Amino acid sequence: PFFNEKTFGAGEADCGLRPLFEKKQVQDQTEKELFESYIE
Amino acid sequence: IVEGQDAEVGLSPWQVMLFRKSPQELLCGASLISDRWVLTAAHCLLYPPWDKNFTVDDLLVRIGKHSYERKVEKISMLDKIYIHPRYNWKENLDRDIALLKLKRPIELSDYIHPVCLPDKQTAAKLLHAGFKGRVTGWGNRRETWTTSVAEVQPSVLQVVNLPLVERPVCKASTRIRITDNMFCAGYKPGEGKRGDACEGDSGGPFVMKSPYNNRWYQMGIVSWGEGCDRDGKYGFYTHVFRLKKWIQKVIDRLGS
Amino acid sequence: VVYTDXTESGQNLXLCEGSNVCGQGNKCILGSDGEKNQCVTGEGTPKPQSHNDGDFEEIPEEYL
Ligand SMILES: *[C@@H]1O[C@H](CO)[C@@H](O)[C@H](O)[C@H]1NC(C)=O
Numbered sequence: 001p002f003f004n005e006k007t008f009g010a011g012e013a014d015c016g017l018r019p020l021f022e023k024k025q026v027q028d029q030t031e032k033e034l035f036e037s038y039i040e
Numbered sequence: 041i042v043e044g045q046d047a048e049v050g051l052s053p054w055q056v057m058l059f060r061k062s063p064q065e066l067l068c069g070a071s072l073i074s075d076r077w078v079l080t081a082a083h084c085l086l087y088p089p090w091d092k093n094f095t096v097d098d099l100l101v102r103i104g105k106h107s108y109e110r111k112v113e114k115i116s117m118l119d120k121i122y123i124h125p126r127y128n129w130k131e132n133l134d135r136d137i138a139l140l141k142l143k144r145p146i147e148l149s150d151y152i153h154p155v156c157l158p159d160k161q162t163a164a165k166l167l168h169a170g171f172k173g174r175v176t177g178w179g180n181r182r183e184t185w186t187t188s189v190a191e192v193q194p195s196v197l198q199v200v201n202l203p204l205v206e207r208p209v210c211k212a213s214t215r216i217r218i219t220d221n222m223f224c225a226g227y228k229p230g231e232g233k234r235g236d237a238c239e240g241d242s243g244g245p246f247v248m249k250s251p252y253n254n255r256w257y258q259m260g261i262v263s264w265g266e267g268c269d270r271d272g273k274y275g276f277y278t279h280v281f282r283l284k285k286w287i288q289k290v291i292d293r294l295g296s
Numbered sequence: 297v298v299y300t301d302x303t304e305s306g307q308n309l310x311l312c313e314g315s316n317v318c319g320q321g322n323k324c325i326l327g328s329d330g331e332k333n334q335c336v337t338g339e340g341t342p343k344p345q346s347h348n349d350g351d352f353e354e355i356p357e358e359y360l
């Protein structure tokens with residue numbers, strides 16, 4: 001934890017994982033583009 | 041967002057709209073970084089040239105919005121405003137960063153979920169010219185209009201993916217002094233593609249997805265632009281990682 | 297903030313010469329037809345903020 005949960009609140013451990021995408025192992029319509037930019 | 045597309049539902053669950061109470065109107069974008077804390081740009085809150093200095097009674101934030109989307113969106117009051125102490129609006133918005141504390145912690149949902157803030161490794165891996173991040177907001181779809189602003193306003197949250205641009209190219213594109221607290225992103229003229237943040241998107245997030253852990257990180261806050269989506273120009277963004285120490289200070293202060 | 301085009305002479309914090317903001321401490325002399333605009337030293341008035349998006353559905357009265 002980079003923040004103390006006591007003042008930051010809940011959310012740091014599970015951050016950046018979308019319930020309708022990553023949580024379901026599903027990709028949004030354009031994220032592939034982002035990864036292509038890292039690779040190509 | 042100029043030259044973007046309707047976002048899928050749940051695309052950007054950390055997306056926040058900052059809203060004036062009376063009259064009701066969109067002021068800026070913002071992002072959710074915990075059940076309790078919202079990140080935005082300083083200039084959304086404090087901007088002397090427009091005689092702007094909001095208090096917590098002036099504002100609401102709206103979260104989980106895709107388009108009043110009840111049983112899906114949460115409206116929250118603010119407990120406290122925090123503006124970076126060294127925020128320099130006099131020159132060109134050095135340190136354009138602010139934190140808002142929600143009156144009460146909110147529940148997370150399919151549509152409401154915090155973004156990650158970058159650490160050292162994240163910044164080192166992800167911030168390279170040509171790597172694409174993503175900007176989202178409810179602002180104008182075009183810099184100008186023929187008849188009325190109403191005509192360039194979107195019905196749903198827009199998204200655009202845009203590449204980080206080399207510092208020298210950012211500096212060469214403008215006469216404004218660029219600092220280490222800023223970066224620019226966007227397509228060069230005669231790249232195949234266009235896109236930019238525009239009016240009403242500022243304070244909103246520039247995020248990147250990590251290949252390493254599959255998580256989304258806010259590398260940026262929409263800060264300033266000369267026009268929207270003009271050729272040979274670039275969107276400028278607050279460098280969140282470079283200002284993380286201030287973020288930590290505020291949040292870790294006792295009774296914050 | 298987005299700097300957009302100066303709409304009357306005397307303004308600053310707006311695009312005056314091409315795509316360049318005319319900053320504080322300066323003001324924008326609007327070229328008439330066939331004239332360039334000029335950003336000059338002088339006291340300017342910030343171009344006012346454009347009427348925000350005020351088109352949303354009304355939220356509960358509780359949030360006031
Ligand atoms: C910001 O407004 C607050 C009033 O709550 C005041 O303490 C502070 O000095 C103000 N700054 C400016 C530039 O008005």
Ligand code: NA
Pocket residue numbers: 226227236269270271272273274
């Ligand atoms: Na551009």
